Amino acid sequence: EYGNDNICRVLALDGGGAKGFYTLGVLKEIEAMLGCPLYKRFDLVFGTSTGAIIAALIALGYEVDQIHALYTEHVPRVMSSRSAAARTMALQDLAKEVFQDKTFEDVLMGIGIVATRWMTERPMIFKGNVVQAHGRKGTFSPGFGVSIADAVQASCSAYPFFERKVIVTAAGDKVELIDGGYCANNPTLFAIADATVALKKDHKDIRVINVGVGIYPEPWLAVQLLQKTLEINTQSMDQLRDILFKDIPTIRISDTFERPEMATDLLEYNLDKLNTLRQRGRESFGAREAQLREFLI
Amino acid sequence: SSLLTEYGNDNICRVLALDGGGAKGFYTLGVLKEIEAMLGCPLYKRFDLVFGTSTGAIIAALIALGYEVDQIHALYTEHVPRVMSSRSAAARTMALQDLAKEVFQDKTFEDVLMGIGIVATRWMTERPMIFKGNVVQAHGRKGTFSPGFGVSIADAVQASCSAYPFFERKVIVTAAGDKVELIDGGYCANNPTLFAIADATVALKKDHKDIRVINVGVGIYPEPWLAVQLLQKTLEINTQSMDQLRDILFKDIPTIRISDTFERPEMATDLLEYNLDKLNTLRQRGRESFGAREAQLREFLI
Amino acid sequence: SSLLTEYGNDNICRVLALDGGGAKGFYTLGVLKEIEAMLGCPLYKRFDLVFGTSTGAIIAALIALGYEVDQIHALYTEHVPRVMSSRSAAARTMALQDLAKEVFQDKTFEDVLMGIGIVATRWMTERPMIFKGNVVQAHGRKGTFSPGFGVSIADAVQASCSAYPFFERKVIVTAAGDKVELIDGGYCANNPTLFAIADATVALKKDHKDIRVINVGVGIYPEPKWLAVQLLQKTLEINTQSMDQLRDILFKDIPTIRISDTFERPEMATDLLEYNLDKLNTLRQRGRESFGAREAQLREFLI
Amino acid sequence: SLLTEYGNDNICRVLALDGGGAKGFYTLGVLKEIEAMLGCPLYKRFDLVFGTSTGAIIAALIALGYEVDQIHALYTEHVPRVMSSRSAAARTMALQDLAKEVFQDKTFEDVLMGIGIVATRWMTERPMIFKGNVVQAHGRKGTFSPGFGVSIADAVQASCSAYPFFERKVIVTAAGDKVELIDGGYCANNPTLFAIADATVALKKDHKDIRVINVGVGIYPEPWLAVQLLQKTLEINTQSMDQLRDILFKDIPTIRISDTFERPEMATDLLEYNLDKLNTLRQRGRESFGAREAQLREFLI
Ligand SMILES: Nc1ncnc2c1ncn2[C@@H]1O[C@@H]2COP(=O)(O)O[C@H]3[C@@H](O)[C@H](n4ccc(=O)[nH]c4=O)O[C@@H]3COP(=O)(O)O[C@H]2[C@H]1O
Ligand SMILES: Nc1ncnc2c1ncn2[C@@H]1O[C@@H]2COP(=O)(O)O[C@H]3[C@@H](O)[C@H](n4ccc(=O)[nH]c4=O)O[C@@H]3COP(=O)(O)O[C@H]2[C@H]1O
Ligand SMILES: Nc1ncnc2c1ncn2[C@@H]1O[C@@H]2COP(=O)(O)O[C@H]3[C@@H](O)[C@H](n4ccc(=O)[nH]c4=O)O[C@@H]3COP(=O)(O)O[C@H]2[C@H]1O
Ligand SMILES: Nc1ncnc2c1ncn2[C@@H]1O[C@@H]2COP(=O)(O)O[C@H]3[C@@H](O)[C@H](n4ccc(=O)[nH]c4=O)O[C@@H]3COP(=O)(O)O[C@H]2[C@H]1O
Numbered sequence A: 001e002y003g004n005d006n007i008c009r010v011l012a013l014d015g016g017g018a019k020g021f022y023t024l025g026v027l028k029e030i031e032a033m034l035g036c037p038l039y040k041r042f043d044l045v046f047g048t049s050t051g052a053i054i055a056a057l058i059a060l061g062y063e064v065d066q067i068h069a070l071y072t073e074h075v076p077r078v079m080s081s082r083s084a085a086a087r088t089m090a091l092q093d094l095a096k097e098v099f100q101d102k103t104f105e106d107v108l109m110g111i112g113i114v115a116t117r118w119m120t121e122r123p124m125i126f127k128g129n130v131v132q133a134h135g136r137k138g139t140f141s142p143g144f145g146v147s148i149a150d151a152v153q154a155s156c157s158a159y160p161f162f163e164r165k166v167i168v169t170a171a172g173d174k175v176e177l178i179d180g181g182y183c184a185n186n187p188t189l190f191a192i193a194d195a196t197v198a199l200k201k202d203h204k205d206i207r208v209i210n211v212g213v214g215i216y217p218e219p220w221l222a223v224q225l226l227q228k229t230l231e232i233n234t235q236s237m238d239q240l241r242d243i244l245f246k247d248i249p250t251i252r253i254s255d256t257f258e259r260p261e262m263a264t265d266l267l268e269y270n271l272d273k274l275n276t277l278r279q280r281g282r283e284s285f286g287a288r289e290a291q292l293r294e295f296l297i
Numbered sequence B: 001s002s003l004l005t006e007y008g009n010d011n012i013c014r015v016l017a018l019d020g021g022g023a024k025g026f027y028t029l030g031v032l033k034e035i036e037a038m039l040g041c042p043l044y045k046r047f048d049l050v051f052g053t054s055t056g057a058i059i060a061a062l063i064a065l066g067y068e069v070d071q072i073h074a075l076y077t078e079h080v081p082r083v084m085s086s087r088s089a090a091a092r093t094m095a096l097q098d099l100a101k102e103v104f105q106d107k108t109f110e111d112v113l114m115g116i117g118i119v120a121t122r123w124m125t126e127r128p129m130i131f132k133g134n135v136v137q138a139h140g141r142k143g144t145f146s147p148g149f150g151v152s153i154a155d156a157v158q159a160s161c162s163a164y165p166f167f168e169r170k171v172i173v174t175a176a177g178d179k180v181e182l183i184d185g186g187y188c189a190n191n192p193t194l195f196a197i198a199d200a201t202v203a204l205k206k207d208h209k210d211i212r213v214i215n216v217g218v219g220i221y222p223e224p225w226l227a228v229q230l231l232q233k234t235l236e237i238n239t240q241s242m243d244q245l246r247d248i249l250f251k252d253i254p255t256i257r258i259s260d261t262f263e264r265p266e267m268a269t270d271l272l273e274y275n276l277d278k279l280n281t282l283r284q285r286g287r288e289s290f291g292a293r294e295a296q297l298r299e300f301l302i
Numbered sequence C: 001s002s003l004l005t006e007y008g009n010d011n012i013c014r015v016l017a018l019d020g021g022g023a024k025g026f027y028t029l030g031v032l033k034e035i036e037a038m039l040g041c042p043l044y045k046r047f048d049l050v051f052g053t054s055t056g057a058i059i060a061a062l063i064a065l066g067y068e069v070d071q072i073h074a075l076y077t078e079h080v081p082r083v084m085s086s087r088s089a090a091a092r093t094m095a096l097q098d099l100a101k102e103v104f105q106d107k108t109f110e111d112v113l114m115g116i117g118i119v120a121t122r123w124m125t126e127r128p129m130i131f132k133g134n135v136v137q138a139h140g141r142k143g144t145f146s147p148g149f150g151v152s153i154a155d156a157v158q159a160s161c162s163a164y165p166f167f168e169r170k171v172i173v174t175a176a177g178d179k180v181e182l183i184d185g186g187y188c189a190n191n192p193t194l195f196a197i198a199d200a201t202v203a204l205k206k207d208h209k210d211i212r213v214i215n216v217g218v219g220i221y222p223e224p225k226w227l228a229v230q231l232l233q234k235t236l237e238i239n240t241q242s243m244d245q246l247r248d249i250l251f252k253d254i255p256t257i258r259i260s261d262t263f264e265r266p267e268m269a270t271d272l273l274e275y276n277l278d279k280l281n282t283l284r285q286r287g288r289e290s291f292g293a294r295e296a297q298l299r300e301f302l303i
Numbered sequence D: 001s002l003l004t005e006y007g008n009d010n011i012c013r014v015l016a017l018d019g020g021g022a023k024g025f026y027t028l029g030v031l032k033e034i035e036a037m038l039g040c041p042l043y044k045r046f047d048l049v050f051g052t053s054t055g056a057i058i059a060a061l062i063a064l065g066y067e068v069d070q071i072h073a074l075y076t077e078h079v080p081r082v083m084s085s086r087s088a089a090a091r092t093m094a095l096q097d098l099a100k101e102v103f104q105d106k107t108f109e110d111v112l113m114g115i116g117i118v119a120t121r122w123m124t125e126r127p128m129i130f131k132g133n134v135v136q137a138h139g140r141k142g143t144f145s146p147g148f149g150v151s152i153a154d155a156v157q158a159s160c161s162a163y164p165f166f167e168r169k170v171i172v173t174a175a176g177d178k179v180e181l182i183d184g185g186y187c188a189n190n191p192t193l194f195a196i197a198d199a200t201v202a203l204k205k206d207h208k209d210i211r212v213i214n215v216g217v218g219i220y221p222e223p224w225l226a227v228q229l230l231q232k233t234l235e236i237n238t239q240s241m242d243q244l245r246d247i248l249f250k251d252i253p254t255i256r257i258s259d260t261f262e263r264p265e266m267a268t269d270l271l272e273y274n275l276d277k278l279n280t281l282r283q284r285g286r287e288s289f290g291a292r293e294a295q296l297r298e299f300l301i
Helices: A017-029 A051-059 A063-079 A083-099 A148-154 A188-198 A222-244 A271-279 A289-294 B023-039 B057-063 B069-075 B082-083 B090-103 B155-159 B192-199 B225-249 B276-291 B296-299 C023-041 C054-064 C067-085 C089-102 C153-159 C193-197 C224-249 C277-289 C295-302 D020-039 D054-063 D067-083 D089-093 D152-158 D192-198 D227-238 D242-248 D276-290 D295-298
Strands: A007-014 A045-047 A110-117 A123-126 A163-167 A174-178 A205-209 A251-252 B013-020 B050-052 B116-122 B128-132 B171-172 B179-184 B211-217 B255-257 C015-018 C050-052 C114-118 C172-173 C180-182 C211-216 C254-259 D014-019 D046-050 D114-121 D128-130 D169-172 D178-182 D210-215 D254-257
Touching: A007 A188, A017 A051, A017 A063, A017 A205, A017 A271, A045 A051, A045 A188, A045 D054, A051 A063, A051 A110, A051 A148, A051 B013, A063 A083, A063 A271, A083 A148, A110 A148, A110 C295, A123 B192, A148 A163, A148 C172, A174 C277, A188 A205, A188 A222, A188 B225, A188 C295, A205 A289, A222 B192, A222 B225, A251 A289, A251 C211, A271 B255, A271 D276, B013 B192, B023 B057, B023 B069, B023 B082, B023 B211, B023 B276, B050 B057, B050 B192, B057 B069, B057 B090, B057 B116, B057 B155, B057 C277, B090 B155, B116 B155, B116 B192, B155 B171, B155 B179, B192 B211, B192 B225, B211 B296, B211 D169, B255 B276, B255 B296, B276 B296, B276 D178, C015 C054, C015 C193, C023 C054, C023 C067, C023 C277, C050 C193, C054 C067, C054 C114, C054 C153, C067 C089, C067 C277, C067 D276, C089 C153, C114 C153, C153 C172, C193 C211, C193 C224, C224 D227, C254 C295, C295 D054, D014 D054, D014 D192, D020 D054, D020 D067, D020 D210, D020 D276, D020 D295, D046 D054, D046 D192, D054 D067, D054 D114, D054 D152, D067 D089, D067 D276, D114 D152, D152 D169, D192 D210, D192 D242, D210 D295, D254 D276
Parallel strands: A007 A045, A007 A205, A045 A110, A205 A251, B013 B050, B013 B211, B050 B116, B211 B255, C015 C050, C015 C211, C050 C114, C211 C254, D014 D046, D014 D210, D046 D114, D210 D254
Antiparallel strands: A110 A123, A110 A174, A163 A174, B116 B128, B116 B179, B171 B179, C172 C180, D114 D128, D114 D178, D169 D178
16 A cells, blocks of 8 residues: 555465465455555565465565466476476476576565575575675675576475475585475564564564464374474474564464365365365455454555 | 682673583583682572573583582482483383482472573473473463472473483373373473573563573584484474574674584494493593683673 | 775784695685675785695785685686596696696795795705795894795795695705705694794784784594504694694783684595595585674674 | 702793603703702702603602602613513503602692693693692683692603503593593603793793703614604604794793714614613713803803
8 A cells, every 4th residue: 555654564474285275365365455466565575385486476576366377287286296206397397487587686575485404404595685684794695696496496395205406506506405394384483583683673563464374184103203393393483483572463374174074185186175275264364354454554 | 518609699690501412411511510610609609590401401400409510420420321221212211210219309399599491392282391480480371370380390300301212201290280291302492592591581581781691512423214314304403493593583692602513433422322431531521612711701700 | 896995004913824724725715705705805905914834825825916715716626626636646746736837837925915924844854944925024044035935936835735645745946056855834834823923923023912813724524554544643633733722822812713613424524635526615615604603703803 | 968058039940851761861961960060959949840751750750859869770770671671561561660669659749849741632632731739720720639639650651651662541530530641752742842831821920030941862863654754743843843942932041951963873762771871871961061061050050
């Protein structure tokens, strides 16, 4: 609506597998209440694994309408690959068709993509502005001089199913990355650290609209431990956020479903089930409609 | 006693956070032995908060009760190595259960002389469980606050030292009769430094210019399937990412970290070490790491 | 063309010492890169003295000749890998001579833009042979002082990098005519921090207060009859470690910063004679990350 | 026999002994001529003495209060017995019977002067310098136990543990720490640069009020591509350290007593055990004191 109001609204998108059709429904009930593309009422856009695709397109062009078509055309196909190498090939073509040649300079709003380094074991975060980092200024090239087609492709590669990406920075050093779900499945906490410390904002200035994908049921003792350890981090990171930044206006939109006919597998290639998740989630906004307009205006 | 220096009260709040790594805690004793003598009094008279983790809780508790370093080292070398020599996973729990009953016989969380906190991980909820000591350190729900959940200070430690693939799972019953399930605290936070500042910043409100953090680890050593490597790889990512977040958020706080990295094939251990001569080498390695930074630690705490 | 900022004169005298490694010099190229862009000017505009051992001698010379860091990195990966690829003592010596011919051929110890010192060990006298630039850096015999023994830089740096077991001893002919035989400068001082300290206290008599010391190493990495072998390895480590312990006893009240980290994981097992550019590329990333921790402190030293 | 008193001036006088093995006899010949010039035990004039692997057995006996005439009696009887044993294991064993019969259960509290003994840490690769007073320490003055609560029979035996011909030794300090040490002739063979530091940063003194006396064993002739290097690098450390000394500490009046011999009538052997050969080394020491008596009289008086 208006131009500026000294209110920094951040957007943290979760993401994983085909279940990202949920947040496409939530984000569909929005951008109509507003009337403008979702980047016209936001200053930061964070996305870890599947919200990274939604993060880019929102940041460099088209609205949700188009995104949905680009998401139902290529994404349901890549999961339908019975080999780990085949999934990596279709993902490369996906990243090559929706992102042809645009890079981190053609981005319209502040964006941060989450990725994990396989050797240093600490997250890599692609940023797009000079005053966005906290240290080591100088030799700071937006997006490491990398193309967006290769930045998102790395941030979507789950190791046990995909292949580990190898990116060639502009400075000439090959980095071996994996998807940003292994370090932060929820970029909410990281998003607070940019507006607070880097952008130098007060503690009552920001409105954090966090959108998720939802919780769903299921269709060697190390395999159980992987699922258990990969859930403690996301929960503990959430609890930590509530203790540190308890005085920040936040709204989390991610509901839990318990019906047996709703259990997914994070890789469901069924257009006759992803459509239902797109529907259940258009109602999850209908319960907080009166509250979200206090944040977006 | 031979430690009689009385330090006057001041407005500065000095925090101490102890890392845990198992039987490799001898590195922590060697470092703390030098810090006490530099002061001249037991550590409970100069520090205002103490947190710990799996093996650091056995040390973090004794510092809060009032024990001196020379007494802590007298017990840490006869009970800790003997439980790591247990073969069966059921034997490592029967042996750890006898440890806390000979060091923390009957005391509770109401007989501590400083701020305390012990980290433990829930299994069902998958969130931390920190055993506070005073209601002033809580972050809500203060109307039903009981120091230490009404749990004895011996069981709060037995739960934090129990790693799942090697120990058993601990079941405690609090005051209100709630059978909670817990495992080692090295899953949610291996370095409680980020948990320690959070408890001393929004609770016990202190500015960023009046806090002195001192993090003492256990060191870094070389190594002595597909789903198994992934497991170890995920754990390192969480630890190396949790402290970087601390560096971004909390960088205006004077902080000193005392840990050392070794690369020789002789200094190769794991968290199952029970060799007396090997552990002794780790002890005198920590004392050397203090002298390199003594010129600065004297400025923080005189 | 990019670095344009200027820094005025001042009384505090800085110093820079570079450890002598091998193919592991890529680690130092990362640390120096971050420091360069941070300052915003070539290093010969802020530092007032630079020492260097075998591998740091190439960098210590190029830094003293006006070259930037983005130019040294090009001249480093272009030739050094060939030097390490050879599998013979005479072959490595020939490549080392071809290297020292193209990077600088017609240059002597009189085009240096700052004060320089290059460490090299004699084979007969068993005392160091430190090539200096000006006469004020000398301690004795100030009646016959040619700035650099009359020797050119092409073979002055070639003598420093002559590890006798894998290379051949270098024979130098000075201006007076003395035929001297030298070996790697890493046999007498693998860390020239102490030597540079002594050259800025007894000569160029600055008090301990106003001396800012910066020592950039190469990092410690794991290793991938046998009695005299180990015992030779231990003797080389004893001299290196004992010399550092002697340093912080006398010159304890001098501000200093040492940037050299340690790694222990098996994927990093870098040793001497490394020629795989893939592993050598990873080390340049580590040195770039090692500066990120001490960036707040180094800003107090260099301003 | 030895009756002479000297006033307590403001000048410190250091004595640094080197190490060469059985060649210590050369040092005794020089000390016999210095004491006789003063007419008093050496501890009443000197304030600090360091040693390394040969001077330990001598610097220890000096700081206790012995006289040179009594040291030579023990040195001539027990030292050549050590080197006579031809085995890497028998030399380390016989070296115990040397310290167990001389320093019979003594500590670093029974000293009348500042002492310092040098050794080498096998695992850490740094020096271990035993001392006997807290005012000679550089930091970590807390938890300072004189001599690490170790006896003198073991601190001396460690500084004479030359790995090629001797075995390693293990040392248990006061705080149950098991350290592994070797000979001290690997980190510093001439303890001149160590003593000057221990008397400048600790025992703060001006370079105008110090007088160092360094005595060695002399340089004598010698009677695979991997051994050559080892013998070369050991003497590149000895050298380049004397040079570092001459550059840093130049305004400190000093005297060195070590003469070079070239004839083939010598036999460089730290493992020497021929009495007629060692008696000659003892004579060259006295012959060397005569050329520098005029100056030693100016320093010691
Ligand atoms: N909000 C946050 N919350 C928690 N942690 C955060 C947050 N933001 C960053 N980090 C972590 O901070 C670490 C170091 O950040 P620095 O600011 O010190 O320097 C940056 C920058 O100068 C430069 N650079 C950055 C982006 C770009 O597009 N091109 C580019 O060149 O590289 C360094 C990136 O390194 P990593 O990305 O691998 O690691 C990061 C990250 O893990
Ligand atoms: N410094 C920290 N760093 C990182 N995480 C932290 C920190 N502090 C708390 N948390 C997490 O936040 C959750 C809620 O904490 P609260 O302080 O808001 O409420 C507390 C308190 O009221 C009461 N209580 C606490 C301690 C005690 O000895 N007796 C007692 O009665 O019980 C609740 C504790 O329950 P958990 O401990 O199981 O859950 C905690 C923890 O997961
Ligand atoms: N900072 C130091 N740290 C550690 N050791 C050092 C240091 N400086 C000198 N030494 C050692 O001390 C010995 C004598 O040094 P001097 O300075 O007293 O005399 C110098 C000078 O007058 C002249 N000369 C020097 C350099 C030059 O480029 N042209 C030139 O003409 O030759 C003599 C050099 O000979 P070496 O170099 O072979 O021997 C040196 C070295 O072994
Ligand atoms: N003049 C010198 N020149 C060059 N280097 C020197 C010099 N003096 C010491 N060092 C080196 O400096 C390192 C650290 O010494 P520190 O002074 O810091 O603290 C001492 C002291 O507090 C305590 N202690 C000492 C003597 C004793 O009889 N009982 C006792 O308890 O133990 C530490 C001994 O350690 P090491 O001996 O193993 O190593 C030493 C040494 O290698």
